[PDB]
Amino acid sequence: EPEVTAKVYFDVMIDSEPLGRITIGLFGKDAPLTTENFRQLCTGEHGFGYKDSIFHRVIQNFMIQGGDFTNFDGTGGKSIYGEKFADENLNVKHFVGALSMANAGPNTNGSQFFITTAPTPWLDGRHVVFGKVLDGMDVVLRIEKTKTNSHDRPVKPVKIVASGEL
Structure with a gap:
């Protein structure tokens, strides 16, 4: 596993129920542009970020997805460098x-990301892996079980009520 160079977190709630904190370690040496984008979106330094956004898609035994703080449906989001930036390291599985x-093809990284909850070989080589959950994996597993309906979207919004750097 690559080196963790920075830590960020998300405090999560589901309609009045606090689920806890997810601590994420970033691979700053293996993906500098990618980790910096995520880090600054967590702090909200530029005026926008993950604070108060949701996990708009949840697929049990696969992953949870978030990061669309502009459209809240999977069609938006934007990086700190602009609308899109290139793929840095595609060799990390x-x-x-x-x-x-x-992303939506090569070099289309913005702000959306997923946290995998199972092996996902069919994503390898096509998505830039830039970090990992250091603590709070139980919170991730709880979100994965939340009731979804049509389109794999949580019936109750899964909200990131706070984010930042640790």
């Missing part, structure tokens, strides 16, 4: 608890 960038 996914593993349970990995943080990976969602």
Whole structure:
């Protein structure tokens, strides 16, 4: 596993129920542009970020996805460098608890990401893995079990009520 160079977190709630804190370690040496984008979106330094956004898609035994703080449906989001930035390292394979960038083809990274909860070999080589859950994996597993309906979207919003750097 690559080196963790920075730690960020998310405090999560589901309609009045606090689920706890998810601590994420970033691989700053293996993916500098990607980790910096995630880090600054967590702090909200530029005026926008993950605070008060939701996990809009949950697929049991696969992953949870979030990061669309502009449209809240999977069609939006934007990086700190602009609308899109290139793929940095595609040689790191996914593993349970990995943080990976969602995208719409090569060099289209923005702000959306997923946290994998199971092996996902069909994503390997196509999505940049830039970190991993260091603590609070139980919170991730709880979210994965939340009731979804049509489109794999949680019936109750799964909200990130706070984010930042640790």
